[PDB]
Amino acid sequence: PPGPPGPPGPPGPPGPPGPPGPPGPP
Amino acid sequence: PPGPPGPPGPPGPPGPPGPPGPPGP
Amino acid sequence: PPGPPGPPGPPGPPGPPGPPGPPG
Numbered sequence: 001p002p003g004p005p006g007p008p009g010p011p012g013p014p015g016p017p018g019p020p021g022p023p024g025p026p
Numbered sequence: 027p028p029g030p031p032g033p034p035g036p037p038g039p040p041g042p043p044g045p046p047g048p049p050g051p
Numbered sequence: 052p053p054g055p056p057g058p059p060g061p062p063g064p065p066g067p068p069g070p071p072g073p074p075g
Contacts, residue, residue, distance in 0.1 A: 002027045003052045009035035012060035018044030019065075024072035025050045029054030038063035047072030 003029040003054065005029045006032035006054035006056045008032045009057035009059045011035050011063075012038035013062050014038045015041035015063035015065045017041050017066050018068045020045050021043075021047035021069035021071045023047045023050050025074045028052050031054050032057035034057045035060040037060045040063050041066035043066050044069035046069045049072045050075035
């Protein structure tokens with residue numbers, strides 16, 4: 001009979017960076 | 027015969043912080 | 052015998068925003 005499934009894969013790549021922060025103060 | 031492929035792994039970590047914002051008025 | 056490992060997961064979520072900008 002066919003063997004078990006393989007192990008799960010590794011983690012994916014990091015997500016992209018976040019958007020710019022808010023403008024600074026006056 | 028071998029088994030089928032395992033399930034996909036977990037998502038990657040969160041990305042790094044974004045660039046600083048523009049200067050204020 | 053076991054199958055091959057699965058593929059890598061999807062990208063993680065976007066990071067947080069950067070810090071506020073400097074004073075004007």
